[PDB]
Write a protein that binds this ligand. Structure first.
Ligand SMILES: Nc1ncnc2c1ncn2[C@@H]1O[C@H](COP(=O)(O)OS(=O)(=O)O)[C@@H](OP(=O)(O)O)[C@H]1O
Ligand SMILES: Nc1ncnc2c1ncn2[C@@H]1O[C@H](COP(=O)(O)OS(=O)(=O)O)[C@@H](OP(=O)(O)O)[C@H]1O
Ligand SMILES: Nc1ncnc2c1ncn2[C@@H]1O[C@H](COP(=O)(O)OP(=O)(O)O)[C@@H](O)[C@H]1O
Ligand SMILES: Nc1ncnc2c1ncn2[C@@H]1O[C@H](COP(=O)(O)OP(=O)(O)O)[C@@H](O)[C@H]1O
Ligand SMILES: [Mg+2]
Ligand SMILES: [Mg+2]
Lengths: 205, 205
């Protein structure tokens, strides 16, 4: 349960050369926009709108969404703390791949644990890939009100164990690059705030 | 250890839209080029050359290499059959994501087990994403004689247990899309054959 006798194999294409090949707009802009927040905060809504916005603006990107990823790559993971650690760890590594390829990678995972969000950042920092932690911030009471997928109601009645914000911790970002107050903003205002961040950080022209 | 109460989250961007954004060469051509073969057969040499080639010809792509992924995403897997199953499963899912994103994903994993290669294919087929299995085929005695990484010498000494071809199985591809006889072709010739396949399949114009 640990890779041994493995040797790093260097690619034969530079990041600059990938910058040239990816998209129609010149420059390398691989990075990760790491959304984090409560269930129902608006993570998927923002991430899917952002992906649409970026593609519409000639920037190849890809959304890795916790729910979707948990139907493939991370289908063998549950919601114990251990398993959420592994879930985020695997996607942080995938996200780093997407970013290294030159895509703007957008992850919409709960990612409830500081240490694991930091671990994701550091994977990216070590690769010289910009990493933007975005706190999709709606009050839990708002999130439960929305109860989009009926999960909070199930969690309430004890029918789902370990539900984030009900029976599992959410560790509020303390140092995110951007906070999105999705209870007081609309989706397009939230997208706009992320775009403004990406323009400031030379990812969106 | 199973994802529960997860729901598919639809993207707001189509494959068509992605193909307009991804290259400077229009049309969607997301797919996976899945290499397989003995250690030392030439998988990384071909995969890195192919990646360089495709980037140099304006085709976004990314190489997922077994040694590399086993230092990040799959660092927590060894080389037991079950771990190689899980190794390959994870990367097939990741490959699917790259291909879905509109990149040519090139994997270079020993991927010694027919059934796991088949599953990788089926994951792609399930997503209407082309999948090309490329058997990087040098005879074991040739791979041993190259022994760049000194692994065969170690395996043979029993310094490395469960080494493919020595103390672990390699199930030869019986229906790959392409065979690369790397004992009798140079890398650029092996690249040209994969490019030729990709042209037949309308992945490279
Ligand atoms: N117990 C429990 N807790 C939290 N969430 C649960 C749980 N069970 C299922 N779900 C569904 O899975 C989605 C969360 O998956 P993530 O991969 O984002 O979670 S995590 O990052 O590993 O914490 C989450 O999606 P969002 O609503 O988008 O957050 C739910 O649809
Ligand atoms: N026991 C054993 N067997 C085979 N290979 C081993 C082993 N131990 C370490 N290595 C190193 O790991 C590389 C193979 O990893 P892969 O992920 O490609 O293997 S697999 O698909 O899970 O079979 C392999 O790389 P290649 O030489 O490119 O095949 C080796 O560098
Ligand atoms: N500014 C906003 N950004 C994102 N979502 C919002 C916003 N305002 C309201 N919402 C709503 O909040 C709900 C959150 O759903 P979702 O995107 O599934 O959240 P998560 O992925 O965090 O579970 C959606 O019904 C969405 O329409
Ligand atoms: N088609 C080829 N012809 C001649 N030598 C090759 C070919 N492909 C690879 N090699 C050489 O064989 C060795 C092993 O190749 P590598 O790409 O690391 O194999 P794998 O990834 O399958 O273990 C390297 O020294 C490499 O230069
Ligand atoms: Mg969501
Ligand atoms: Mg190799």
């Amino acid at each position: 349960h640990m890779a041994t006798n493995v040797t790093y194999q260097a690619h034969h294409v530079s990041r600059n050369k990938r910058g040239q090949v990816v998209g129609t707009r010149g420059g390398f802009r691989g990075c990760t926009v790491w959304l984090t927040g409560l269930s129902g905060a608006g993570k998927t809504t923002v991430s899917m709108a952002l992906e649409e916005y970026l593609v519409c603006h000639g920037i190849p990107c890809y959304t890795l969404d916790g729910d979707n990823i948990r139907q493939g790559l991370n289908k063998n993971l549950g919601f114990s703390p251990e398993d959420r650690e592994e879930n985020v760890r695997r996607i942080a590594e995938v996200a780093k791949l997407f970013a290294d390829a030159g895509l703007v990678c957008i992850t919409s995972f709960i990612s409830p644990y500081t240490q694991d969000r930091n671990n994701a950042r550091q994977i990216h920092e070590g690769a010289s890939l910009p990493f933007f932690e975005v706190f999709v911030d709606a009050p839990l009471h708002v999130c439960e009100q929305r109860d989009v997928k009926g999960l909070y109601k199930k969690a309430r009645a004890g029918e789902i164990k370990g539900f984030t914000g009900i029976d599992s911790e959410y560790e509020k970002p303390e140092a995110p690059e951007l906070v999105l107050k999705t209870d007081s903003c609309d989706v397009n205002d939230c997208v706009q705030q992320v775009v403004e961040l990406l323009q400031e950080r030379d990812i969106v022209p």
